[PDB]
Design an enzyme around this catalytic site. Structure first.
Site, PDB file in Angstrom:
ATOM      1  N   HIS A 119       0.848  -1.178   0.000  1.00 43.20           N
ATOM      2  CA  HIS A 119       0.000   0.000   0.000  1.00 43.20           C
ATOM      3  C   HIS A 119       0.879   1.222   0.000  1.00 43.20           C
ATOM      4  CE1 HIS A 119      -2.352  -3.185   2.162  1.00 43.20           C
ATOM      5  NE2 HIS A 119      -3.237  -2.853   1.240  1.00 43.20           N
TER       6      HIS A 119
ATOM      7  N   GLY B  94      -6.412  -6.481  -2.169  1.00 40.25           N
ATOM      8  CA  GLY B  94      -6.609  -7.894  -1.954  1.00 40.25           C
ATOM      9  C   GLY B  94      -7.470  -8.430  -3.069  1.00 40.25           C
TER      10      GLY B  94
END
Ligand SMILES: *Cc1c(COP(=O)(O)O)cnc(C)c1O
EC number: 2.-.-.-
Lengths: 330, 314
Positions: free
Chosen positions: A63, A115
């Site tokens: 991230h 994800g």
């Protein structure tokens, strides 16, 4: 003139070094006034720090990469949790199996947008399409939704979500082994958890960051040296973590804590690769980390990284059945 | 370009209207992107919002007053929890009694700053001095430290700390009545904004409160379904203690969100007397950003207020 530090998650066992740096007065003794904040939605985290609204915090390796690519200037200045096993977790009789083909027609949960992006792309390498399966956003509740049968499997960390499953199985009298993971590693480094700063904040306050990490180091030492006394202090301050689940999680986390706080070059290299392939990162993208603000010698690169990884898998299995605090030896 | 909303405390049952405004998509349907944050230390809250680092939040009336006095520009734009009973909580056999004199030589817990200031000042009105008693900062753990005997009594809310004690007593087989408490408006919980933020984004705040109102209505209309949604999202609240707390909170929720003029007037007085506020200090609230009509014997309503979901009738 407080400095804001925003966690990646609700308080977890692995935030201990930060909370302790607070409670033990390490931040204070550095002339830092830290305002630790917890998010309601991890998705909000990189954007808040990147935009300078919040000064520092934590997020996963990926991230942090995707944050700069997506226009939010953050830099990793240290490492908290190194290479925790990440994967799709499921209970035996889901009915899901070691073959990624079983994911067909199953509801598979994820937390982050990424994800989904990860699963979406894995489906191509196994012949299936998005969507021969349903992806469900679950935020910080993946394991919970698994146990309640709202999803069939979902993405998680071996030392958090997996433990939550094992503890649930123990209640049902089922064996811990019934909690299974399809590893995305088998570069599980995507979910390494990092200390990150706003690029602008770091530019203007280099010395405060250096001092911040000194405090973090002092506490990290304490936690590794005497995990049990540490844990008692932690949960005295944060009682929501005073349960058996949290303690088992804590033990599984022990072996993954970074003792040196150093960003691992190899890992960053690998994940940036992954990042470019997934189209998450531009072709000319450059890894946004630095070890400059760490004030102690860098450790020697792990000689055989892939054997250390399969050695850890064993080490962690022992931790589960022995309930111990041991660092992986090399 | 997210808007930051920072709670006054760890997630509590009384934050429900905010979280639901999030989960139910009321914020989204207003074109607002709210980043709800929870503090590790309530004391950090007003300074963060006042300094503009954080846009909005919750804080208690006294805190909100003292915030501007102390140089942090915040304005109350709405009200969340109205006049919850606040006081010094203790367990029977502490040994503490209805007479404030019993506080002598006892360890007394307070949450952050203001509680000590409050206790310190009460000691003068009863002949004793700071310190004929020991004040202990406990943060969000006052009730917990009472139960563990680290303190003898501490400052808290009837619908939170007191319930935590009652639930502990039930475990020891003791009766709930054994949990005892010695302008209770100081701990009214408010929706507050950064003065500058409010100046620049009046319409977003107005829309914020619209979303909040919609959820507040749902919570009051159907508390049980509401609660189930809330704890589906925030499982840490899925326990019996939290539910009992929720029930005790129900009667204190503000249905209109309006700042109550009388209350602010009283607490500002208190504020000036305690020296917390300057002589020419002016209450920092406003009902301008509420988009529905304001509602119409306060001391009888208070004694009237003193396992069901019922609103107080007048
Ligand atoms: C900030 C806060 C307190 C307490 O801090 P004191 O200065 O000790 O009062 C108590 N309750 C709430 C809801 C708060 O926000």
């Amino acid at each position: 003139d407080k400095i804001t530090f925003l966690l990646n998650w609700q308080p977890t066992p692995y935030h201990i070094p930060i909370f302790l740096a607070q409670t033990k007065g390490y931040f204070k003794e550095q002339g830092l006034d830290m305002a630790i904040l917890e998010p309601t939605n991890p998705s909000d985290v990189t954007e808040l720090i990147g935009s300078g609204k919040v000064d520092m915090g934590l997020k996963a390796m990926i991230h942090t990469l995707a944050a700069k690519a997506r226009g939010f200037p953050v830099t990793s200045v240290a490492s908290l949790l190194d290479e925790p096993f990440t994967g799709v977790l499921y209970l035996k009789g889901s009915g899901i199996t070691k073959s990624f083909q079983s994911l067909k027609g199953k509801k598979i949960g994820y937390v982050g947008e990424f994800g989904k992006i990860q699963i979406d792309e894995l489906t191509k390498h196994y012949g299936m399409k998005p969507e021969d399966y349903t992806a469900v956003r679950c935020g910080m509740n993946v394991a919970k939704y698994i146990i309640e049968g709202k999803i069939d499997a979902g993405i998680g960390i071996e030392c958090m979500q997996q433990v939550e499953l094992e503890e649930y199985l123990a209640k049902q009298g089922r064996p811990a082994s019934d909690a299974k993971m399809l590893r995305i590693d088998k570069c599980c480094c995507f979910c390494t958890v990092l200390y990150i700063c706003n690029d602008e904040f770091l530019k203007k306050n280099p010395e405060k960051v250096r001092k911040f990490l000194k405090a973090i180091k002092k506490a990290t030492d304490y936690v590794l040296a005497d995990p049990v006394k540490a844990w008692k202090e932690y949960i005295d301050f944060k009682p929501q973590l005073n349960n058996d689940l949290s303690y088992k999680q804590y033990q599984r986390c022990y072996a993954y804590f970074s003792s040196s706080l150093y960003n691992v070059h190899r890992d960053w290299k690998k994940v940036t690769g992954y990042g470019k392939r997934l189209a998450i990162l531009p072709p000319d993208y450059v890894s946004n980390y630095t070890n400059e603000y760490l004030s102690w010698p860098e450790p020697e690169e792990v000689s055989d990284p892939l054997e250390a990884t399969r050695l850890m898998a064993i080490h962690q299995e022992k931790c589960r059945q022995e309930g111990t605090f041991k660092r992986l030896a090399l």
